[PDB]
Amino acid sequence: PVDFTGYWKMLVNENFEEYLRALDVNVALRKIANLLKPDKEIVQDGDHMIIRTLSTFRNYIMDFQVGKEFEEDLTGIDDRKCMTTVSWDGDKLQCVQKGEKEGRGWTQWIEGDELHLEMRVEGVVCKQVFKKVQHHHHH
Ligand SMILES: COc1ccc(S(=O)(=O)N2CCC(O)(CO)CC2)c2c1CCCC2
Numbered sequence: 427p428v429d430f431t432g433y434w435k436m437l438v439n440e441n442f443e444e445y446l447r448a449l450d451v452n453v454a455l456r457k458i459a460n461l462l463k464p465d466k467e468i469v470q471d472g473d474h475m476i477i478r479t480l481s482t483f484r485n486y487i488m489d490f491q492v493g494k495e496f497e498e499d500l501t502g503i504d505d506r507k508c509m510t511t512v513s514w515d516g517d518k519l520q521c522v523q524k525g526e527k528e529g530r531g532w533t534q535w536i537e538g539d540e541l542h543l544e545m546r547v548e549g550v551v552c553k554q555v556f557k558k559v560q561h562h563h564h565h
Contacts, residue, residue: 428517430475430534434466434541434556445545445552449504449527458483466541466556467565475512480565488512498523 446456464481473493479486486503490496490512498510500523508525515533523530530547541556 428514428519428536429470430468430477430519430536430541431470432468432541433559433562434468435559436463436465436554437540437557438553438555439463440553441550442552442554444550445547446504448548448550449506451504465559466543468541478565485565492519 443456443460446459451459462481462483464479464486467476467478467480469476473491475488475490475492477488479488484502488498490498490510492512492514495509495511498508500506500508506525506527508523508530510521510523512519512521514520517535519534521532521534523532527547529549532543532545534544535542539558541558543554543556545552545554
């Protein structure tokens with residue numbers, strides 16, 4: 427069984443500017459966000475999953491029950507809210523974010539020491555890869 431618990435450091439962030447543009451993030455804020463290399467701190471506790479995206483600019487925290495649709499507040503990302511469901515798809519974790527934007531969601535999986543995160547909106551695809559790490563720092 428797949429367990430995402432751990433601390434993960436960003437290695438690559440591919441096509442993030444177009445993903446942000448598709449979310450209508452303003453130009454000045456895209457400049458800031460494109461420089462960020464956030465960590466992921468994940469705790470999988472039964473079906474309760476916490477995914478913290480940690481950066482020097484701000485943190486974005488997801489805290490949900492797998493399988494249960496919830497109102498996700500993305501105010502700090504693109505000023506939207508979505509009805510979001512995160513579910514298992516075999517060994518992958520799928521997120522569908524229903525809202526104003528078509529085809530918004532993400533897929534997360536592990537390969538070896540890598541956390542893979544593919545983020546999608548309106549036919550744009552952004553791919554991030556993080557490496558599992560062990561030196562922890564307070565947040
Ligand atoms: C404008 O500032 C942002 C825009 C997008 C992202 S982000 O795309 O890395 N981010 C994590 C993945 C997801 O949760 C997927 O829905 C969206 C939010 C983030 C920020 C600022 C701080 C942390 C991350």
